[model samples]
Target: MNDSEFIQLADQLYQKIEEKIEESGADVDYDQNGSLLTLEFENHTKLIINRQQPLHQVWLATLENGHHYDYNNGKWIDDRSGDEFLTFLSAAIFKQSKETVDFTE
Candidate 1:
């Protein structure tokens, strides 16, 4: 998805998670996605708000090794770290625009 569309969906997901946390009185750690949010529970489990990627595909990632994880087609596929999937998420959350990103190439 494009930047603006991603931001809008992220906002809605953030609000939903925020409301749920307040109602349940659950103490979960969270990280913002721009204005979006993901709740990391006390149980070492975290839920990320899913985003669309018509240009690419869905991926799950880790902090240490930047790999693209695909959960489609009833199997998992691993892509290389050079792809920088998590970096995309990070930049989407923190950067103001695509032009502002600096990956130190």
Candidate 2:
């Protein structure tokens, strides 16, 4: 996909997760600035998700590791692990918060 397409898709995915977290009333706070989304937890740790326009990838950064995901098939798959983005986010959030939040529909 082109840059515009990637931005559109990335924004949609970002908004969806933001909406879900808001609706779920989780003990997490988030901010969206341009193409970057930042999730801050109660413990003061954060998870950052941003779109890489040049690479056409969604990048995620957690306390333990940084992951890059490309849109493949119909989902975002990690470049190294082939794991779905939402699944990875769920696990990562759980690890940080000790609470479960499912980002997948």
Candidate 3:
């Protein structure tokens, strides 16, 4: 996809995740700045999601690991694990917060 396409898709993904977090009512705080979204949990951990414009990818970073995802087959799949981005985020959030928040909708 072109830069504009990637930007649009990335923004949608970011906004969706933010909406899901709000709907879940989990004890997590989030900040969105341009292309970066940071989620800070009550446990003093964080999940950072950002758009990599140069690579046309989305990146996720936690205290333990980092993952990059590329758009494929209409979904963002992790470059290393092939896991869907939202699914990975959901699992990661659960692991960090011990609270289930679904971002796959």
Clashing pairs in 3: none
Quote the lDDT for 77 in model 3: 98
TM-score of each: 0.37, 0.94, 0.94
Best by lDDT: 3
Give the residue spans of candidate 1 off by over 4 A: 1-6, 53-105
What are the per-model numbers of colliding residue pairs?
0, 0, 0
Model 2 steric clash pairs: none
Candidate rank order under TM-score = 3, 2, 1
Candidate 3 per-residue lDDT over residues 17-85, each given as its tens digit: 889989999888989988889999998999999899989999999789889999998889999889999
lDDT of 3 at 102: 88
Residue range 1-105, candidate 2, lDDT tens digits: 999899888988898788878777788888989878999899898999988899999999999899999999878999999999999998888899876667887
Superior candidate under lDDT, 2 versus 3 = 3
Q: Show model 3 residue runs off by greater than 4 Å.
A: none
What is the lDDT, from 0 to 100, of the residue 70 in candidate 3? 99
Residue 102 lDDT in candidate 1: 26
Q: lDDT-based ranking, best first?
A: 3, 2, 1
